[PDB]
Scaffold this motif. Structure first.
Motif, PDB file in Angstrom:
ATOM      1  N   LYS A  57       0.848  -1.196   0.000  1.00 30.36           N
ATOM      2  CA  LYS A  57       0.000   0.000   0.000  1.00 30.36           C
ATOM      3  C   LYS A  57       0.879   1.240   0.000  1.00 30.36           C
ATOM      4  O   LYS A  57       0.583   2.229  -0.665  1.00 30.36           O
ATOM      5  N   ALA A  58       1.968   1.211   0.776  1.00 33.09           N
ATOM      6  CA  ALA A  58       2.889   2.331   0.761  1.00 33.09           C
ATOM      7  C   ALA A  58       3.536   2.560  -0.613  1.00 33.09           C
ATOM      8  O   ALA A  58       3.675   3.733  -1.027  1.00 33.09           O
ATOM      9  N   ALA A  59       3.962   1.483  -1.273  1.00 30.35           N
ATOM     10  CA  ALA A  59       4.571   1.521  -2.615  1.00 30.35           C
ATOM     11  C   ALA A  59       3.530   2.131  -3.562  1.00 30.35           C
ATOM     12  O   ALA A  59       3.842   3.048  -4.366  1.00 30.35           O
ATOM     13  N   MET A  60       2.282   1.704  -3.433  1.00 26.60           N
ATOM     14  CA  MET A  60       1.217   2.311  -4.255  1.00 26.60           C
ATOM     15  C   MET A  60       1.071   3.811  -3.981  1.00 26.60           C
ATOM     16  O   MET A  60       0.918   4.600  -4.927  1.00 26.60           O
ATOM     17  N   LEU A  61       1.083   4.240  -2.705  1.00 33.14           N
ATOM     18  CA  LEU A  61       0.895   5.648  -2.373  1.00 33.14           C
ATOM     19  C   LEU A  61       2.025   6.467  -2.908  1.00 33.14           C
ATOM     20  O   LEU A  61       1.827   7.627  -3.226  1.00 33.14           O
ATOM     21  N   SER A  62       3.202   5.863  -3.082  1.00 30.80           N
ATOM     22  CA  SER A  62       4.343   6.669  -3.593  1.00 30.80           C
ATOM     23  C   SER A  62       4.079   7.258  -4.966  1.00 30.80           C
ATOM     24  O   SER A  62       4.677   8.278  -5.309  1.00 30.80           O
ATOM     25  N   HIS A  63       3.153   6.664  -5.703  1.00 34.11           N
ATOM     26  CA  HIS A  63       2.845   7.119  -7.044  1.00 34.11           C
ATOM     27  C   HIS A  63       1.992   8.380  -7.060  1.00 34.11           C
ATOM     28  O   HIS A  63       1.803   9.005  -8.128  1.00 34.11           O
ATOM     29  N   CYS A  64       1.491   8.789  -5.895  1.00 34.08           N
ATOM     30  CA  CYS A  64       0.818  10.088  -5.742  1.00 34.08           C
ATOM     31  C   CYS A  64       1.834  11.269  -5.769  1.00 34.08           C
ATOM     32  O   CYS A  64       1.448  12.428  -5.778  1.00 34.08           O
ATOM     33  N   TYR A  65       3.134  10.949  -5.742  1.00 27.73           N
ATOM     34  CA  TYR A  65       4.203  11.959  -5.683  1.00 27.73           C
ATOM     35  C   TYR A  65       5.010  11.981  -6.972  1.00 27.73           C
ATOM     36  O   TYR A  65       5.870  11.132  -7.193  1.00 27.73           O
ATOM     37  N   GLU A  66       4.722  12.966  -7.820  1.00 24.69           N
ATOM     38  CA  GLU A  66       5.211  12.956  -9.198  1.00 24.69           C
ATOM     39  C   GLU A  66       6.638  13.496  -9.375  1.00 24.69           C
ATOM     40  O   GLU A  66       7.434  12.916 -10.127  1.00 24.69           O
ATOM     41  N   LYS A  67       6.945  14.605  -8.700  1.00 23.67           N
ATOM     42  CA  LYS A  67       8.259  15.234  -8.805  1.00 23.67           C
ATOM     43  C   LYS A  67       9.305  14.323  -8.206  1.00 23.67           C
ATOM     44  O   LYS A  67       9.038  13.655  -7.209  1.00 23.67           O
ATOM     45  N   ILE A  77       1.486  10.477   7.091  1.00 22.31           N
ATOM     46  CA  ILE A  77       2.419  10.961   6.092  1.00 22.31           C
ATOM     47  C   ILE A  77       1.720  11.783   5.012  1.00 22.31           C
ATOM     48  O   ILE A  77       2.266  12.826   4.569  1.00 22.31           O
ATOM     49  N   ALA A  78       0.514  11.369   4.623  1.00 19.20           N
ATOM     50  CA  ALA A  78      -0.230  12.051   3.583  1.00 19.20           C
ATOM     51  C   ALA A  78      -0.630  13.427   4.120  1.00 19.20           C
ATOM     52  O   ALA A  78      -0.452  14.470   3.459  1.00 19.20           O
ATOM     53  N   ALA A  79      -1.121  13.470   5.353  1.00 17.97           N
ATOM     54  CA  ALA A  79      -1.476  14.771   5.928  1.00 17.97           C
ATOM     55  C   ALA A  79      -0.284  15.749   5.988  1.00 17.97           C
ATOM     56  O   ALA A  79      -0.393  16.914   5.552  1.00 17.97           O
ATOM     57  N   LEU A  80       0.855  15.260   6.490  1.00 17.29           N
ATOM     58  CA  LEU A  80       2.030  16.094   6.605  1.00 17.29           C
ATOM     59  C   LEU A  80       2.530  16.624   5.265  1.00 17.29           C
ATOM     60  O   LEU A  80       3.175  17.692   5.224  1.00 17.29           O
ATOM     61  N   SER A  81       2.265  15.885   4.192  1.00 18.12           N
ATOM     62  CA  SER A  81       2.692  16.345   2.873  1.00 18.12           C
ATOM     63  C   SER A  81       1.565  17.022   2.085  1.00 18.12           C
ATOM     64  O   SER A  81       1.719  17.269   0.885  1.00 18.12           O
ATOM     65  N   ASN A  82       0.457  17.379   2.752  1.00 20.93           N
ATOM     66  CA  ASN A  82      -0.663  18.047   2.121  1.00 20.93           C
ATOM     67  C   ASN A  82      -1.298  17.344   0.930  1.00 20.93           C
ATOM     68  O   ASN A  82      -1.875  18.000   0.038  1.00 20.93           O
ATOM     69  N   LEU A  83      -1.223  16.021   0.932  1.00 22.32           N
ATOM     70  CA  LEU A  83      -1.889  15.213  -0.072  1.00 22.32           C
ATOM     71  C   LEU A  83      -3.353  15.144   0.307  1.00 22.32           C
ATOM     72  O   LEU A  83      -3.701  14.726   1.416  1.00 22.32           O
ATOM     73  N   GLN A 130      -7.181  13.937   0.680  1.00 21.76           N
ATOM     74  CA  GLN A 130      -7.801  12.652   0.922  1.00 21.76           C
ATOM     75  C   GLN A 130      -8.312  11.966  -0.361  1.00 21.76           C
ATOM     76  O   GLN A 130      -8.187  10.749  -0.485  1.00 21.76           O
ATOM     77  N   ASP A 131      -8.906  12.729  -1.284  1.00 20.27           N
ATOM     78  CA  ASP A 131      -9.358  12.108  -2.535  1.00 20.27           C
ATOM     79  C   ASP A 131      -8.200  11.494  -3.334  1.00 20.27           C
ATOM     80  O   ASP A 131      -8.335  10.390  -3.891  1.00 20.27           O
ATOM     81  N   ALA A 132      -7.052  12.174  -3.343  1.00 16.59           N
ATOM     82  CA  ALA A 132      -5.892  11.695  -4.079  1.00 16.59           C
ATOM     83  C   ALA A 132      -5.322  10.496  -3.349  1.00 16.59           C
ATOM     84  O   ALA A 132      -5.000   9.480  -3.984  1.00 16.59           O
ATOM     85  N   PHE A 133      -5.224  10.625  -2.023  1.00 17.97           N
ATOM     86  CA  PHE A 133      -4.774   9.496  -1.183  1.00 17.97           C
ATOM     87  C   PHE A 133      -5.607   8.244  -1.484  1.00 17.97           C
ATOM     88  O   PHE A 133      -5.077   7.152  -1.765  1.00 17.97           O
ATOM     89  N   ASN A 134      -6.932   8.397  -1.456  1.00 18.55           N
ATOM     90  CA  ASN A 134      -7.812   7.239  -1.637  1.00 18.55           C
ATOM     91  C   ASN A 134      -7.684   6.603  -3.022  1.00 18.55           C
ATOM     92  O   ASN A 134      -7.717   5.388  -3.171  1.00 18.55           O
ATOM     93  N   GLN A 135      -7.511   7.437  -4.025  1.00 18.03           N
ATOM     94  CA  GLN A 135      -7.304   6.963  -5.370  1.00 18.03           C
ATOM     95  C   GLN A 135      -6.004   6.186  -5.449  1.00 18.03           C
ATOM     96  O   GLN A 135      -5.971   5.085  -6.013  1.00 18.03           O
ATOM     97  N   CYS A 136      -4.936   6.744  -4.886  1.00 18.82           N
ATOM     98  CA  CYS A 136      -3.632   6.094  -5.038  1.00 18.82           C
ATOM     99  C   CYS A 136      -3.556   4.739  -4.307  1.00 18.82           C
ATOM    100  O   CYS A 136      -3.009   3.767  -4.846  1.00 18.82           O
ATOM    101  N   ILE A 137      -4.099   4.690  -3.093  1.00 21.89           N
ATOM    102  CA  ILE A 137      -3.994   3.509  -2.275  1.00 21.89           C
ATOM    103  C   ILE A 137      -4.860   2.347  -2.772  1.00 21.89           C
ATOM    104  O   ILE A 137      -4.702   1.221  -2.312  1.00 21.89           O
ATOM    105  N   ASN A 138      -5.779   2.641  -3.714  1.00 29.71           N
ATOM    106  CA  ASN A 138      -6.675   1.638  -4.301  1.00 29.71           C
ATOM    107  C   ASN A 138      -6.509   1.432  -5.822  1.00 29.71           C
ATOM    108  O   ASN A 138      -7.293   0.726  -6.463  1.00 29.71           O
TER     109      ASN A 138
END
Length: 199
Positions: free
Chosen positions: A71-81, A113-119, A121-129
Motif C-alpha cells: 500500500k505504501a509503494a502504491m501511495l508513492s505514485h501520488c508523488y510525481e516530482k 504521512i499524507a497529511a504532513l505532505s498536504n496530499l 484525501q481524494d488523491a490518497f484514496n485513489q492512489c492507495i486503491n
C-alpha cells in the motif's frame, strides 16, 4: 533479460542527473528494518556525495513483502516530482517504528504521512486503491525475482551508466546493509574508471 533490466526504464523514477557517469539501482521493501536503518544512517551521505553532485543516477524500485509495504509503494505514485517521490519513500523508511505491529492492515501511518505532505484525501484514496499501479509494482517485483534472483533486501546494482555495455548482473550486485565506507570504496573506484573512459 537481466541486462535489459539494469538500465533506466521509461517508467523508472529517477533521482539525480540522468546522464551521470554511475548508475545505482536499489530494490527494497519499505517495511524492512535493516533497509530503514540504511536509509536513515548511510543513504543521506551517499546522496550528498554522489547524487547531488551529479556523479551518480539513483533508481529506487519497490519490492513490497506485505500489505503495509505494498500500500505504501502504491501511495508513492501520488508523488510525481523526483524529490517528492524520494522524500515520500524516505518518510516511510524513517517512520518504521510507527506502524501497527498487531493490526497489519492498519494504514494510519500512511494517513499521517499524507497529511504532513498536504496530499488531499481524494488523491490518497485513489492512489492507495489504484489497481493499475498495484499490478505494475507486483509485476516489476516478480520480474526482479525471475530475472535478477532477488530474495532479501536491500539489494543494489552499481554500474557504469552506459546502455551499450554487457555485464553479468551478479558481478555488479551488493546485498544487505553496508556501511558508508563500503559504498564509497565501490563508487569511487567505478567513477574513476568512468571518467577515464569518458575522456
Amino acid at each position: 533479460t537481466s541486462n535489459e533490466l539494469l538500465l533506466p526504464l521509461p517508467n523508472d523514477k529517477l533521482l539525480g542527473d540522468p546522464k551521470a557517469p554511475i548508475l545505482m539501482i536499489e530494490y527494497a521493501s519499505l517495511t524492512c528494518y535493516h533497509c530503514s536503518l540504511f536509509h536513515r544512517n548511510v543513504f543521506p551521505k551517499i546522496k550528498e556525495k554522489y547524487i547531488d553532485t551529479g556523479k551518480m543516477l539513483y533508481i529506487f524500485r519497490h519490492f513490497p513483502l506485505d500489505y503495509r509495504g505494498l500500500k505504501a509503494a502504491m501511495l508513492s505514485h501520488c508523488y510525481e516530482k523526483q524529490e517528492d517521490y524520494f522524500n515520500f519513500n524516505k518518510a516511510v523508511f524513517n517512520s518504521i517504528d510507527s506502524w501497527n505491529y498487531y493490526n497489519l492492515s492498519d494504514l494510519t501511518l500512511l494517513q499521517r504521512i499524507a497529511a504532513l505532505s498536504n496530499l488531499k484525501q481524494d488523491a490518497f484514496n485513489q492512489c492507495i486503491n489504484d489497481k493499475k499501479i498495484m499490478d505494475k509494482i507486483v509485476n516489476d517485483k516478480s520480474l526482479a525475482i525471475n530475472k535478477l534472483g532477488i530474495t532479501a533486501t536491500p539489494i543494489f546494482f552499481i554500474k557504469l551508466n552506459d546502455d551499450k555495455s554487457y555485464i553479468e548482473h551478479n558481478k555488479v550486485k551488493h546485498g544487505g546493509y553496508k556501511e558508508l565506507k563500503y559504498f564509497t570504496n565501490v563508487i569511487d573506484k567505478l567513477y574513476g574508471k568512468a571518467i577515464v573512459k569518458l575522456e
